[PDB]
Amino acid sequence: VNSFSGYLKLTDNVYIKNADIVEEAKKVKPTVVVNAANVYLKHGGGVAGALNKATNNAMQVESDDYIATNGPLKVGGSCVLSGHNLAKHCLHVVGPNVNKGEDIQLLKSAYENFNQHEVLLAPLLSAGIFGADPIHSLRVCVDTVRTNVYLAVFDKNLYDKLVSSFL
């Protein structure tokens, strides 16, 4: 039993809700919140900009130190950093950004990072401003993640389409 509320169950391990991931994280304080990161951990917009804003820029400060030490992530890769006031940990995961020409096949590799954590609150990787088809992202999520994932979909209209089209 966990404290996630109001989710529709899609499969044995995947759940979905129309929600602002920032507000969800502040309520649940999950062990792991997933950020839709880029390789530079520059949290400018989308989920990343919103999460970072909610941390009063502490996420960005921590991220800049991480990059200065370690260099950029790989597309499809991840790192674990602090969750600040939102969660115990933040798993920064880089899905391919179609608006940069990156290979959509890397989306499966990106979701594989979720399997290192028993339970996660997460967005749909590569959706939104990353330019991929969210229906496809949900399909890859369900077919790749084996741990318990609670997906927050910000856009209500998109949420309804994802549910109604789910196979």
Q: Binding residues for ligand A1A97, per CB under 6 A?
A: 20-22, 36, 46-47, 50, 123-124, 127-128, 152, 154-155, 158
Q: Tell the smallest beta-carbon distance from residue 69 to ligand A1A97 (Å).
A: 27
Q: Tell the smallest beta-carbon distance from residue 9 to ligand A1A97 (Å).
A: 19
Which residue minimizes CB distance to ligand A1A97?
Answer: 128
| DSSP state letters, 75-122 | TT-EEEEE-TTT-SEEEEE----GGGT--TTHHHHHHHGGGGSSEEEE
Cβ proximity to ligand A1A97: between 65 and 155 the closer is 155
Q: Tell the smallest beta-carbon distance from residue 19 to ligand A1A97 (Å).
A: 7
Checking DSSP bridges between strand 14-18 and strand 119-122, what pairing results, if any? unpaired
**Of 123, 111, 128, 116, nearest to 151 (Cα)?**
123
Cβ proximity to ligand A1A97: between 79 and 150 the closer is 150
HSE-CB for 101 with a 13 A CA cutoff: 0
